[PDB]
Amino acid sequence: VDLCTEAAERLDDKNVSDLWVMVKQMTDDTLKSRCSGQMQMAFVRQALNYLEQSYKNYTLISVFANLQQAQLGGYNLVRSFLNIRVWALIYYCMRCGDLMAAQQVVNRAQDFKNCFQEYIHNKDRRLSPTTENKLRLHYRRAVRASTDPYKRAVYCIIGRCDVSDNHSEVADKTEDYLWLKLSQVTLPQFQKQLFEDYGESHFAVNQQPYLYFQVLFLTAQFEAAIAFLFRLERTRCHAVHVALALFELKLLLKSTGQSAQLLSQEPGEPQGVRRLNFIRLLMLYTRKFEPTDPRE
């Protein structure tokens, strides 16, 4: 990872810089490991961090470009953005990934306090207590019809309900759609959804291969992202080292039979499991270059 990243920075390609930093970020019986609930939780929280920092960088960039309108001051940054752009504050906050600013915001306009902390920060191990049943209830009752897009979106996020609603009134970038649907997370269901229901054409990967990758890899579909980016020419070498990293990492799932197509799903696997012939991969890959650069 570090060797490749240092190579990439020296290579001076923006998208690759991004993808490699993401590779690192996301990286911190391999089939069994890929599917373990803790492992999913980790891959997710990692991608969430990646996106949080991403949009927060977006906030920094936009505010520093629009200083004049920003009235930046010396909670603040989000206000400055909202000028350039209560439920609105918390929404645009969380979509920049800093939950604590939104926490201050909710604190100002505040048994419900222990509950709120339980929702965000406080562990709140309780005995014979009922949680997330009451929230979804009222939300369906009143909030589901609310005229406050930000408010209804926040209700969806908190209570893991109304997963159908794109709530696109306050979510416009695929970044958001992810952030939300993720925050609502059964992992294989959404996995198929993005992989199968949305499919490639929706992601229009033609321009944004890096996107469709990020989409797959964020969701722990490693074999997918590998395969997809592999189909691309310019990405080939990259995925290779990527795959190699995953291999030693005990993080890549190999296909068993040599003549299998590059991507394969084997019977009886938990759905969304795919396997790739790391050998057949490296073979077909290097084949182009063996006659020239033998030592390679």
Binding site: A65, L67, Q68, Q71, L72, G73, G74
Partner: protein, 431 residues
């Protein structure tokens, strides 16, 4: 272009100073006339004859020659002044510095002008020293006085122009410098007269020779002091100019340009002042240069400050790696101390004043340097014999300025992005 305007204002300020001096010459001539012919039992006749000789044509000719000599002296101040003191680190270095072709030429010029002035005094001292062995002795005394004046101006570095720590009306500074200049002229005349008498022995008269030497040395010290007090006059540089045409005359460019160093130190003092009391120029320093939203002013200013600071840091860590070396590694630290104080206090105020947060965008940056600089300083204080006056000034300004910034930011600094190494020292200082 800024070199031409700076040099013109400099020649005109040489004009103002040498103008005060040229106005002051004739009263001194009359004083010498009354003193050389002091008749204690005939005051009315002595004063009347001194008034008649004060109107005599020879006296006017002597005054004109002395004025030409003083003009040569003012041009000398204009030509060989310094904005950094001349320090001989070794005695052989001093002997070499006194042997330069230009400095030997200056010494010869001083000897010749002193011979001329002594001849003028002898002709003004009507009597046996009017026409050319006493007159030759007075001339030799004048020449030796000139040579000694050049040598002393070199040793005590009187060619160093001290920027006034407190700006005062030139009349008050002149009045203050008056008693010291007078007493110094008297004492130097006495000592040089003793030395010249011994020298003449080896290879009425004494009173007149001492009077002439005292008058010449007093004129020289007054010329030097006036040239200083006026050529060191503070000028305010407009921070941002309504025209790009005055952009070279703005403190930012003149501070970042290769103009004469005198203007650099002047603009340094000027900016320190503006940051001290001029709030409008301050807001213009944090101004967003349109078009581009760039705080170009504050940017260039802080950039220059930190450049000089990193330079001084490298110099300290270098010369540290002996007592003269660690004393010289931070001799240039006065400007760095001024910059550290002003900048960190401006940050301390930015937590309330910079309504655009224009300073926040570099906040973290500054912190690094400070911690980094501080670290080096500690290692500096680590080498023995280094912990036994710009050095202490920079140390104190740094510590105090960081302390001010920290205790102004208070808790909101805990949100600032800093290197954990810098963070430990941050906690320490806030504690």
């Amino acid at each position: 272009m800024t070199m031409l305007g700076e040099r013109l204002v400099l020649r005109w300020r040489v004009a103002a100073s040498f103008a005060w001096s040229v106005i002051l010459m004739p009263v001194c001539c009359a004083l010498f006339i009354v003193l050389s012919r002091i008749q204690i039992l005939h005051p009315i006749q002595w004063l009347t004859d001194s008034i008649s000789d004060l109107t005599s044509s020879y006296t006017i000719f002597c005054l004109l020659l002395i004025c030409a000599i003083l003009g040569l002296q003012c041009t000398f101040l204009m030509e060989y002044y310094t904005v950094v003191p001349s320090i001989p680190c070794s005695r052989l270095a001093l002997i070499g510095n006194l042997l330069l072709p230009h400095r030997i030429l200056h010494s010869l010029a001083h000897v010749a002008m002193g011979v001329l002035a002594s001849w003028c005094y002898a002709v003004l001292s009507k009597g046996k020293y009017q026409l050319l062995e006493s007159h030759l002795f007075q001339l030799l005394c004048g020449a030796f006085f000139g040579y000694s004046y050049s040598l002393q101006y070199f040793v005590h570095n009187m060619n160093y122009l001290s920027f006034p720590s407190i700006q005062q009306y030139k009349y008050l500074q002149f009045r203050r410098f008056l008693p010291l200049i007078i007493k110094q002229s008297v004492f130097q005349s006495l000592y040089f007269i003793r030395s010249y008498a011994i020298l003449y022995f080896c290879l009425s008269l004494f009173y007149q020779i001492w009077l002439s030497g005292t008058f010449l040395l007093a004129t020289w010290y007054m010329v030097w002091i006036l040239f200083r007090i006026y050529t060191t006059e503070a000028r305010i540089f407009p921070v941002q100019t309504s025209f790009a045409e005055e952009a070279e005359k703005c403190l930012p460019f003149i501070l970042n340009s290769n103009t004469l160093p005198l203007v650099k130190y002047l603009a340094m003092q000027d900016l320190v002042l503006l940051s001290q009391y001029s709030p409008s120029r301050r807001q213009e320093v944090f101004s967003l240069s349109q078009p581009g939203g760039h705080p170009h002013n504050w940017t260039s200013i802080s950039k220059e400050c930190l450049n000089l600071m990193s330079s001084l840091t490298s110099r300290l860590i270098a010369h540290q790696e002996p007592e003269a070396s660690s004393q010289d590694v931070f001799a240039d630290a006065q400007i760095h101390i001024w910059a550290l104080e002003a900048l960190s206090h401006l940050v301390a105020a930015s937590f309330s004043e910079d309504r655009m947060g224009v300073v926040q965008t570099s906040l973290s940056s500054v912190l690094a340097i400070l911690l980094t600089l501080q670290e080096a300083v500690e290692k500096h204080f680590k080498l023995p014999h280094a912990s036994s006056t710009l050095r202490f000034s920079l140390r104190a300004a740094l510590k105090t300025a960081i302390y001010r910034i920290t205790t102004t930011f208070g808790e909101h600094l805990h949100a600032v992005p800093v290197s954990s190494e810098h963070k430990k020292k941050l906690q320490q200082f806030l504690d």
